[PDB]
Amino acid sequence: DVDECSLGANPCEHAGKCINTLGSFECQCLQGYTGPRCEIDVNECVSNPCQNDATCLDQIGEFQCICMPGYEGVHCEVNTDECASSPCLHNGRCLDKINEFQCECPTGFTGHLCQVDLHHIL
Numbered sequence: 001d002v003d004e005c006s007l008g009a010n011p012c013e014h015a016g017k018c019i020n021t022l023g024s025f026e027c028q029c030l031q032g033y034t035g036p037r038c039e040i041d042v043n044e045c046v047s048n049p050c051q052n053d054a055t056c057l058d059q060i061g062e063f064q065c066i067c068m069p070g071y072e073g074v075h076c077e078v079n080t081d082e083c084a085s086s087p088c089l090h091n092g093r094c095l096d097k098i099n100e101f102q103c104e105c106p107t108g109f110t111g112h113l114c115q116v117d118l119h120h121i122l
């Protein structure tokens, strides 16, 4: 038997661990690498995991998503609820939009956040 792991170069790419066998050898790849000699950098973005026009970053053994405004989550799958912080004053009804909200103000109030009092005028 030749020990392929004790020759001039590591036959395993991308710093994989070479393990000798009788008649051959095997490679124990680092996370994110595949192939008999760990030749391939797995594309973690190949199944399109980043949603809603997010940018997928193909990294070593992982992906990361960069979300379009108004989206969040690991897959950018969550439409951020802009009504969460109760931005509408005076019990205004809050409507969630994309990276935005709308306030439906009660009688006598107006403005994006229902700030303006009109009760005194009438």
Ligand SMILES: *[C@@H]1O[C@@H](C)[C@@H](O)[C@@H](O[C@@H]2O[C@H](CO)[C@@H](O)[C@H](O)[C@H]2NC(C)=O)[C@@H]1O
Pocket (backbone or CB within 6 Å): 053, 054, 055, 056, 066, 067, 068, 069
């Ligand atoms: C990575 O981050 C994303 C949030 C986007 O800004 C990406 O650019 C945008 O790509 C989408 C499709 O994925 C496209 O709809 C847009 O035209 C494009 N540019 C902008 C400025 O939105 C970015 O690569």
Ligand SMILES: [Ca+2]
Pocket (backbone or CB within 6 Å): 001, 002, 003, 004, 020, 021, 022, 023, 024, 025
């Ligand atoms: Ca061998």
Ligand SMILES: [Ca+2]
Pocket (backbone or CB within 6 Å): 032, 041, 042, 043, 044, 058, 059, 060, 061, 062
């Ligand atoms: Ca990768």
Ligand SMILES: [Ca+2]
Pocket (backbone or CB within 6 Å): 070, 079, 080, 081, 082, 096, 097, 098, 099, 100
């Ligand atoms: Ca929203």
Ligand SMILES: [Ca+2]
Pocket (backbone or CB within 6 Å): 100, 101, 112
């Ligand atoms: Ca606004």
